[PDB]
Symmetry: D2
Subunit: 154 residues, 4 copies
C-alpha cells in the first residue's frame, strides 16, 4: 500500500514547451502504475531563484531525492544524454536503486555495439535482459511484460 517512489530524471524542464507538453504524459503513465513520482523540475518550483545560492540548493535537493527514491526513471534522449540526468543516474546506480531507462529518440549515440548508448548508462542493469528495463515509447511504460511493472509487483 506504500507507493514506490520514482525519481523522474529528464532534460525536459529546460524547454518551456517540453516542460509543458512532454513531462505530464510521462508522469501520468508512471502514476497509472501506482508510482509516487518525484520529478525535480516540479519539486523545485518552491526554490527562490532570486537568491545567489539557488543552484547549490537545487543540487542538494536533487541529491536528497535521488538518495531517497526507490528507483530512477531516466529520460536519456538526446545526443548525448543530458549531463544532469547522467549524474543522477550514476548516483542511483551507486546507491543500488532500481534503474529504468527511457529513450524514444531513434538516433544512436554510442561507443559500442551491444548497447544503443554509452556503456556506462547500463552499469546498474543486468548483463542479460537489460532491454526489459529500456523503454522506447511512452505507450510501453504500461507494459506488464517490462521491468517497471514487474518491479512493482515483485
Amino acid at each position: 500500500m506504500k507507493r514506490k517512489i520514482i525519481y523522474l530524471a529528464s532534460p525536459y524542464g529546460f524547454s518551456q514547451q517540453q516542460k509543458t507538453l512532454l513531462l505530464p504524459p510521462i508522469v501520468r503513465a508512471l502514476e497509472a502504475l501506482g508510482i509516487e513520482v518525484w520529478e525535480p523540475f516540479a519539486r523545485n518550483n518552491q526554490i527562490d531563484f532570486s537568491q545567489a545560492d539557488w543552484a547549490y540548493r537545487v543540487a542538494q535537493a536533487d541529491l536528497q531525492d535521488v538518495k531517497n527514491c526507490d528507483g530512477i526513471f531516466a529520460v536519456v534522449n538526446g545526443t548525448p544524454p543530458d549531463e544532469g540526468v547522467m549524474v543522477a543516474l550514476g548516483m542511483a546506480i551507486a546507491l543500488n536503486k532500481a534503474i529504468f531507462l527511457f529513450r524514444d529518440d531513434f538516433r544512436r549515440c554510442s561507443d559500442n555495439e551491444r548497447y544503443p548508448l554509452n556503456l556506462m548508462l547500463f552499469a546498474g542493469l543486468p548483463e542479460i535482459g537489460w532491454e526489459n528495463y529500456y523503454y522506447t515509447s511512452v505507450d510501453e511504460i504500461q507494459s506488464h511484460d517490462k521491468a517497471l511493472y514487474k518491479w512493482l509487483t515483485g
Copy 2:
C-alpha cells in the same frame, strides 16, 4: 598512495588518447597519486567477445567504488555522459571530487557555476573553485584542493 579515477572522454579519439591523456596522468602522478585511467586499465579485456561492453562497465564501476577520489575531465558541450555517470557514482559514494575543464565554452543551466549545477553537488557551497582545474599546468598547484587533499 591515494587513488584517483581519471574519468575523461579522451579514449575515444586516437589523437586524444595518445596526446591529451599522458600529460594529465603525469601531472597527477607527480603529486604521488596512483592514477586509475579506465581506457588503459581495461586494455586486457577481450574486445572480440559480445560481453566486452558489460565487462568494461562493471570494471569501471568497481574502480569508482575502490578509488579515493575522481578526477573528472568535464570538457565538451555538454560533458561526456560516461564521465558524468562516473561522477555521479563518486558523489553518491562520498569520494573526493575534482573537476577539470580547459574548454572555455559555457554549457550551463545557471549563473553560479560554469556547468550544469549537478556536477557540483558533491563539492562545498563555498570554495568549490578550489577543486575546479582549468589547465593541465594548474594540477600541480600547491594552493588547490588536490595538493591539500594529499598532504591533509
Copy 3:
C-alpha cells in the same frame, strides 16, 4: 505565392517530440500566412526500406533549403542539432531569410555577446539580431519581431 519557411528542428527524432512539439510551431507559422516545409513530414514519402533513403533525404532537404524563402531554425539543445546547423549554414550562404528559435534556457556559448555559438548569427545583422531570435512559441506572432515584418 505564399512565403515558404523551412522549419528545421531536431523534433522528428523523438516520437513524443514529433507528435507534441512540432504541430504547435507549424500552426503558429501558418497563422501568419506562411507555407511551412517541415522536413520530417515532407520526407515521409521516401521509401525507408531502400538503402539509398538517407542520401535521398539529404538531397531533398538540400533542395528544400535552396527553394525556401527563409529558415526557421529550432536551435534548442546543448549543443544545437548538427542537421539543423548544416541547413542553417546553407540558408545563410544562399541569402535566405534567417529566424532562430530557442526556448531552451540553457547556454551553450563561446562568446558573451550571443547566447549561442557565434556562427549561428553570421547571417544576422550586427545590431538588432535579437529581433530575429525567438524564445517562446507565443512570441512567434509578435508584430514587433522580424518574421512578422518580413512578411
Copy 4:
C-alpha cells in the same frame, strides 16, 4: 598538384590542450600536401577581443573565409559534431566548395545506417564514393587514393 585553399573547421580551439596538441598535426598534414590552410582560430587572432563586437567580427571573417576558400576540411569529431563547424560545413555545401570530412572519434552519433553521422553532413558529397572524402586518421590525410589528394592534382 595545385595549391588550393582549405578552410580547416574544428572545435579544437576551444580547449587549451587540444588547440596546442591536436590542431597543429592536422595543419601540418594539410600543409604537407601543399595546401594553403586557413585555420580560423589562428586567422582571427588579429581581432580586438576587447571590443564588444568581437564575436560579430569573427563570424563575418569566418563567413568570408568560407566564401573565399576552395574547400572545407571539417573536423566532425564529437557527439554531436560541433555546431560552428556544422554551420561552416552548411555554408560550404551551398557554395559548391569541395568538402572533406575528418573523424577519428570512434563513437557513432547517427540518424541512419548508411553514414556514420547525421545524413545532412553528406549532402554535398556523392551518393557513391563519399567514403573517399571521409578521413578517420591523421595519417590517412596524405593518401593519394583518397579525394583530397586527387582534388589537388586536378
